[PDB]
Amino acid sequence: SVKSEYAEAAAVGQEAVAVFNTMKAAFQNGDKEAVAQYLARLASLYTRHEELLNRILEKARREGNKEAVTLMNEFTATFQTGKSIFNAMVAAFKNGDDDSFESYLQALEKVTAKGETLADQIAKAL
Numbered sequence: 001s002v003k004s005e006y007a008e009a010a011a012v013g014q015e016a017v018a019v020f021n022t023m024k025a026a027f028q029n030g031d032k033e034a035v036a037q038y039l040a041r042l043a044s045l046y047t048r049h050e051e052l053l054n055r056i057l058e059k060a061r062r063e064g065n066k067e068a069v070t071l072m073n074e075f076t077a078t079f080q081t082g083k084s085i086f087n088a089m090v091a092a093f094k095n096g097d098d099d100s101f102e103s104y105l106q107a108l109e110k111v112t113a114k115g116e117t118l119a120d121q122i123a124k125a126l
């Protein structure tokens with residue numbers, strides 16, 4: 001069902017949270033080789049999550065589930081805020097700008113924490 005598809009999407013999201021926290025530790029410790037690998041792993045994970053979310057939103061639209069579509073439209077918009085901040089983090093890493101990397105990382109954390117009550121509301125609406 002769309003609901004089990006959202007549970008699968010949510011797990012992929014939690015995998016990115018786990019890898020992100022590991023990456024943040026590696027950044028603080030200065031292990032740039034690890035950070036590079038974790039950033040590649042996060043890119044693939046966000047690419048997967050985004051696509052799953054899109055399929056869920058498209059299915060909610062085909063089902064006529066207006067509330068779930070509203071919530072998912074908002075949530076995907078927020079996801080793209082996170083995506084832009086993540087990409088800016090990756091560029092800061094490439095450029096060696098640790099000040100910007102720290103900034104973007106904290107902003108990604110706050111964007112993620114904010115969009116959590118919505119994430120739960122979607123599970124209930126689908």
Ligand SMILES: Nc1nc2ccc(F)cc2s1
Pocket residue numbers: 046047050078079080081082083084086087108111112113115
């Ligand atoms: N809370 C979030 N972080 C990211 C990071 C990258 C991305 F593409 C989407 C999101 S949503």
